[PDB]
């Protein structure tokens, strides 16, 4: 299977997010686990 070495979110607005990142690394790591799990589901993986 595939490993998800680094996942990053490029969506940014430096005003709504109060001069900080839009998504904290906690939530990015959560999505990292979720997409790693659905990679381990072993379908056609890249579409999912």
């Amino acid at each position: 299977p595939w490993r998800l070495l680094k996942l990053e979110i490029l969506v940014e607005d430096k005003e709504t997010g109060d001069g900080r990142a839009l998504v904290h690394s906690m939530q990015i790591s959560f999505i990292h686990q979720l997409v790693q799990s659905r990679l381990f589901a072993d379908e056609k993986p890249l579409q999912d």
Partner: protein, 58 residues
Amino acid sequence: QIPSDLEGSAYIKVSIQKQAPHWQTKLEAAQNVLLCKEIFAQLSREAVQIKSQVPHIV
């Protein structure tokens, strides 16, 4: 610890064209950023809401 949204430096820039002590520096810069945000909020609200001759674009 300064609030985020107040870091960096900001300044109002006004132009006319024919076209279409360590902590002291930090706290002064953040206070200046706060006052520039206050100024521009006042200006943009008066531009949008107050009816004036030859209206503006914000």
